[PDB]
Coordinates of C-alpha atoms in Angstrom, one line a residue:
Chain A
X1383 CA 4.3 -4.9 27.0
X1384 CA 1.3 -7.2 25.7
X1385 CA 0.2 -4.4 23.8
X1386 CA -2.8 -4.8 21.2
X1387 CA -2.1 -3.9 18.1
X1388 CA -3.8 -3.7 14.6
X1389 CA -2.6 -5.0 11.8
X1390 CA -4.2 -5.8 8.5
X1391 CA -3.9 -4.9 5.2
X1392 CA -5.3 -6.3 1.9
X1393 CA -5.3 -9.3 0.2
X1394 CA -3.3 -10.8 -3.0
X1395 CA -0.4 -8.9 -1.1
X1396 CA 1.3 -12.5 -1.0
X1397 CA -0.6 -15.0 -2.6
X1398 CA -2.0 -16.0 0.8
X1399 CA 0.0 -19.5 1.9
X1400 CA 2.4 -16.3 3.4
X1401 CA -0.2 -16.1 6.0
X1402 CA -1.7 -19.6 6.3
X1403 CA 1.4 -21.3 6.5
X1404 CA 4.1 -19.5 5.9
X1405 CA 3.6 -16.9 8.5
X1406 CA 4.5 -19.8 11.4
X1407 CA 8.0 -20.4 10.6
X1408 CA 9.0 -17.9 8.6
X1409 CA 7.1 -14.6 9.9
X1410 CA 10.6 -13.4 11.6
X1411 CA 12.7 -13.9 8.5
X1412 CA 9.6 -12.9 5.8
X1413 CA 8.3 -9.8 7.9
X1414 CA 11.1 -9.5 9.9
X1415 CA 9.2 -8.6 13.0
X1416 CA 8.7 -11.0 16.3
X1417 CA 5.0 -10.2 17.6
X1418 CA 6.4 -11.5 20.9
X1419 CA 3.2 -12.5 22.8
X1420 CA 1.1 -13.6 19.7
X1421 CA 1.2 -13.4 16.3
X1422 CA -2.1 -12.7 13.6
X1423 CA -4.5 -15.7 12.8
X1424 CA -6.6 -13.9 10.3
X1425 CA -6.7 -14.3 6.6
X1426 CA -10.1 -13.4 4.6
X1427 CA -10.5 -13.9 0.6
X1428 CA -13.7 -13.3 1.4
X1429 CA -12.8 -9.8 2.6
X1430 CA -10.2 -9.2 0.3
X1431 CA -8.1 -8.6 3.3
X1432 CA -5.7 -10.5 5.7
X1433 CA -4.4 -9.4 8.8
X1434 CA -5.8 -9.1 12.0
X1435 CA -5.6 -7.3 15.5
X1436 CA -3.0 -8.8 17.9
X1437 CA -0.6 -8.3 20.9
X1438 CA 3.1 -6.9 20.1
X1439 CA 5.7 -6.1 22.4
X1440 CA 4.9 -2.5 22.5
X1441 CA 3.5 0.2 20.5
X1442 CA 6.3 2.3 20.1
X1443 CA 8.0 -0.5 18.2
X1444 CA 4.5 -1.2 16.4
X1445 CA 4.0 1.6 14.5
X1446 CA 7.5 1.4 13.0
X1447 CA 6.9 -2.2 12.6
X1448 CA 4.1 -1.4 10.0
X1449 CA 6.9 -0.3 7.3
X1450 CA 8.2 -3.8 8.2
X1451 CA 5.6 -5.6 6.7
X1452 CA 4.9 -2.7 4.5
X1453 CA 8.0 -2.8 2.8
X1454 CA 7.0 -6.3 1.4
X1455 CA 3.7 -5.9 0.3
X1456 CA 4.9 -2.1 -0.8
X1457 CA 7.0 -3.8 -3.7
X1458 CA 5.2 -6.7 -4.3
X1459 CA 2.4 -6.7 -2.8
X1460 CA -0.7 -4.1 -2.6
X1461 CA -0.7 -1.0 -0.4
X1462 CA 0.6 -0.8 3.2
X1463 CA -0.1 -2.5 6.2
X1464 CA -3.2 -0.8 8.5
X1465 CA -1.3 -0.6 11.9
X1466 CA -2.4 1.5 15.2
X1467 CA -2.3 1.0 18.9
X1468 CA -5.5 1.9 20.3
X1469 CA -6.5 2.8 23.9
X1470 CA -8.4 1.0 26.3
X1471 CA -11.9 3.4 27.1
X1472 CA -13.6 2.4 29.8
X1473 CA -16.7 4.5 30.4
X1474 CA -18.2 2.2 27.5
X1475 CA -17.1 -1.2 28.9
X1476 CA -20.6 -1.1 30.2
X1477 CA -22.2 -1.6 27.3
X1478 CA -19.5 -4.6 26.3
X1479 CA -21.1 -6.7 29.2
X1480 CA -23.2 -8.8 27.5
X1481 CA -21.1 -11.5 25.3
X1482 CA -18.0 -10.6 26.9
X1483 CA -19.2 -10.9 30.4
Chain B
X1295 CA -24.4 -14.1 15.0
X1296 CA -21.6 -12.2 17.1
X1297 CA -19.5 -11.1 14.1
X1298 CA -16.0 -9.8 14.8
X1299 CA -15.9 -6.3 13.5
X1300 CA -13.2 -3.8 12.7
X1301 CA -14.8 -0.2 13.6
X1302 CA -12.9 2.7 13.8
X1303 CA -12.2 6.3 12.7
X1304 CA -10.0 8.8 13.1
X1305 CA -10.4 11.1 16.1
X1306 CA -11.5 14.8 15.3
X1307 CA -14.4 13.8 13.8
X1308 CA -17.0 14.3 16.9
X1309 CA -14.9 16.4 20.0
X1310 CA -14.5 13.1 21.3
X1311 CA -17.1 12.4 24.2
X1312 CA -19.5 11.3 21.3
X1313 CA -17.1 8.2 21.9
X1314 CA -16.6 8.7 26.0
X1315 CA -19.6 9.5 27.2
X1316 CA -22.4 10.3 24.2
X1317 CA -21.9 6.8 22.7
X1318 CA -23.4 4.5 25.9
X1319 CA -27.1 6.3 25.5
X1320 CA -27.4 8.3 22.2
X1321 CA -25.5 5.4 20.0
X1322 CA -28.5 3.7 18.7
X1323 CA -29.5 7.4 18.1
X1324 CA -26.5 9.1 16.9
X1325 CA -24.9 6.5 14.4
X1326 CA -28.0 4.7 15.2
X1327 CA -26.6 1.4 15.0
X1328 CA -27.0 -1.1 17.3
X1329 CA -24.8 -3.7 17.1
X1330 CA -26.3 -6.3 19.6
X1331 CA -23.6 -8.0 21.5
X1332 CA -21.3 -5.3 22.5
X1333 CA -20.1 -1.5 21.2
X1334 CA -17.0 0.0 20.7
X1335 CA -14.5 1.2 24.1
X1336 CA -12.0 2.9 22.1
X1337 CA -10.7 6.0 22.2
X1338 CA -7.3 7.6 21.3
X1339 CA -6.3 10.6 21.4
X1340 CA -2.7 10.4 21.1
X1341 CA -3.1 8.2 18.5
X1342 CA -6.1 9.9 16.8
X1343 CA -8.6 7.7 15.8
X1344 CA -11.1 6.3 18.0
X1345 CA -12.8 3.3 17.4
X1346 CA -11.8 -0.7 17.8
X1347 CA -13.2 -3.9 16.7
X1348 CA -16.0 -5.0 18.5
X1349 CA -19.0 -7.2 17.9
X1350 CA -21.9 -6.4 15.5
X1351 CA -25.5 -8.6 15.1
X1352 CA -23.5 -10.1 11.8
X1353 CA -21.4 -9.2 9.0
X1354 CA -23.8 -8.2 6.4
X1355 CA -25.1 -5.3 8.3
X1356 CA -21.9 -4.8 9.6
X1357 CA -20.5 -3.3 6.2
X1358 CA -23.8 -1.3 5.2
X1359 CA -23.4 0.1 9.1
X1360 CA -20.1 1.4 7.8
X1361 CA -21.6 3.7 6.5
X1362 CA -24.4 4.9 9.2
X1363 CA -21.4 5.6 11.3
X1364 CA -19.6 7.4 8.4
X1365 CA -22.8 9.2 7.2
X1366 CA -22.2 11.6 10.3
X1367 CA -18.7 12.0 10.1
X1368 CA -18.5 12.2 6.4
X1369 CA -20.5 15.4 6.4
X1370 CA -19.4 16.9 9.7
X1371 CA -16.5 14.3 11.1
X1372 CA -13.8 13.8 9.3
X1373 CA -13.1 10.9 6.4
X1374 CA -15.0 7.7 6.7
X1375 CA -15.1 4.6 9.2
X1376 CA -12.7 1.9 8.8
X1377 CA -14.9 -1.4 8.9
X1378 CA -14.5 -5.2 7.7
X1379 CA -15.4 -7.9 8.9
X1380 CA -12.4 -10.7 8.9
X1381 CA -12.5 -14.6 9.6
X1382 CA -10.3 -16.7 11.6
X1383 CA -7.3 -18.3 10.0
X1384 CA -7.1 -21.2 12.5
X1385 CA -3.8 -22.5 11.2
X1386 CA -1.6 -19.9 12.8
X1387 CA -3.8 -20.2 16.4
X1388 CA -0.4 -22.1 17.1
X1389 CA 1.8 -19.1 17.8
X1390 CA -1.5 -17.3 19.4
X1391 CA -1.1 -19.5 22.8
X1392 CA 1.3 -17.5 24.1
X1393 CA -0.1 -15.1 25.6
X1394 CA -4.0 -15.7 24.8
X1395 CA -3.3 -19.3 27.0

């Protein structure tokens, strides 16, 4: 459904490498869920957070997919996992016309 | 410096058209933040939040503008604005050309 999704949550969840490397091969086995068009490219020490915004299958399956990840980092790891599907809102795409036109 | 920014709140905060319509010429007013490059198109309802990632002059003021956003909606909106500003984690930009090729 190539729908855009959010999902983030904090870091020294995993140690990290879960995401850097770890996240390629084994992101259906460790987090169980697909991501089906693209998967999440962001880690951030930095931030203190890792996770990103990116294109799942649908939202429906999404939201529910949160608790996926979540229910790693839930007994290891921090917190939960920051997960919505927004909406697209138009009227204000005018104002996004300069660096993404 | 076209910073990447996670901005969003939950809905219920303003009615809604501070988003929709109120945002394109009051923004720089209302939250009076600018953000340079581009402002936020989100809005959802049926999720209820509004807000998306979008980008901000940098990263810097991107965190302090957290909170010139949440100033209004802490005292009339509802919690606070959800903002960070995360990095790319190149490594996994291999299972990202799917659909974003």
């Amino acid at each position: 459904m190539a729908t855009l999704l959010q999902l983030h949550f904090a870091f020294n969840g995993p140690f990290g490498d879960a995401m850097a490397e770890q996240l390629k091969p084994l992101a259906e086995s460790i987090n169980q869920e697909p991501g089906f068009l693209w998967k999440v490219w962001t880690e951030s020490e930095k931030n203190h957070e890792a996770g990103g915004i990116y294109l799942f299958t649908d939202e429906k399956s999404a939201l529910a997919y949160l608790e996926k990840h979540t229910a790693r980092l839930k007994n290891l790891g921090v917190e939960e996992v920051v997960a919505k599907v927004f909406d697209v809102n138009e009227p204000l795409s005018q104002i996004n016309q300069a660096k993404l036109a």
